[PDB]
């Protein structure tokens, strides 16, 4: 989907404009950086970087040197300001134009309680103990079970209804200013459907995308309770990408924040710390996703 559901359309045939994928600005590519590549085939006519965008585009004066772009930079690697290794791919294009989504929604399933606990609750938790500890467990080696400070919380939880679930496995999660944790999906023959992780120390932003290309990134407040079930925790995926800094609703919303709705400004994260709560289960997944089960694509040897 890295240019399929974006509405660029390719060519096979030579054309003097590129379409430089991972080479965007949304994907941490410097101009300083990639133009000095380009121009090592030939005469750099423009060089596209639409913002927020995995890719950019790049014409040459003539297909001449445009064709020997294809040719010589596909597999080039090229460091972005983050220092990591990405790949870049070119294709040919007859025209360059693009597609703009805005989702005005969360993700089905995924939901937001805020202010679940009070500041000063929110302190005790935090001072009870990227770094990483587990509780409640290899479903078959488990321990003596959730924390007691935890065990009560969780019950205050279901005796609402803000989840129905009982959970008896969590994770520890603490990240520090530039820290973050790689986008995943939450393996579906291991743990129950619905899943909920409590966030407190700081303010973050986590990247929830649709297997098709739709991307939301959500606002997670502190002493906010992060539930996703069904659709969102089986079919989209969430992580948390690596920064000190980042793009916020510059008014008010626990939430999706798109662009070009208001006025935007920047946030540094701090000390954040989550506590992810899920509930192992037994029994094989039947989920109407299929495709990102395992627990379904082990009965044909055609996906493993
Ligand atoms: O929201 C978090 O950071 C914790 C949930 C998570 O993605 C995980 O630890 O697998
Ligand atoms: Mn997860
Ligand atoms: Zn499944």
């Known amino acids: 989907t890295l240019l399929r559901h974006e509405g660029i359309e390719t060519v096979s045939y030579a054309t003097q404009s590129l379409v430089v994928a991972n080479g965007g600005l949304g994907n941490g590519v410097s101009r300083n950086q990639l133009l000095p590549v380009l121009e090592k085939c030939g005469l750099v006519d423009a060089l596209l970087m639409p913002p927020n965008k995995p890719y950019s585009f ?18 080039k690697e090229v460091v972005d300001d983050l220092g990591q290794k990405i790949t870049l791919y070119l294709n040919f294009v007859e025209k360059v134009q693009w597609k703009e989504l805005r989702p005005q929604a969360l993700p089905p399933g995924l939901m937001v309680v805020e202010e679940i606990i ?91 995308k649709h297997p098709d290309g739709i991307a939301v990134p959500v606002m997670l407040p502190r002493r906010s309770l992060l539930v996703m079930t069904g659709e969102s925790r089986y079919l989209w995926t969430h992580g948390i990408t690596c920064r000190k800094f980042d793009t916020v609703q510059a008014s008010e919303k626990s939430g999706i924040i798109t662009s070009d709705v208001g006025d935007l400004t920047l946030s540094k994260r701090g000390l954040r710390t989550s506590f992810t709560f899920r509930k192992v289960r037994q029994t094989p997944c039947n989920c109407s996703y299929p495709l990102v089960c395992d627990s379904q694509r082990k009965e044909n040897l055609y996906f493993q």
């Open 118 to 208: 009070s500041s000063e609750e929110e302190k005790m938790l935090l001072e009870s103990v990227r770094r990483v500890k587990h509780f409640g467990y290899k479903d078959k080696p488990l321990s003596g079970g959730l924390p007691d400070i935890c065990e009560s919380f969780l019950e205050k939880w279901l005796r609402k209804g803000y989840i129905k679930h009982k959970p008896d496995q969590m994770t520890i999660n603490q990240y520090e200013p530039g820290q973050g944790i790689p986008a995943h999906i939450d393996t579906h023959s291991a743990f129950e459907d619905e899943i909920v992780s409590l966030s407190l120390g700081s303010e973050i932003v986590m990247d929830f």
């Open 58 to 75: 790049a014409r040459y004066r003539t297909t001449e040197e445009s064709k020997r772009a294809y040719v010589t930079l596909n597999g």
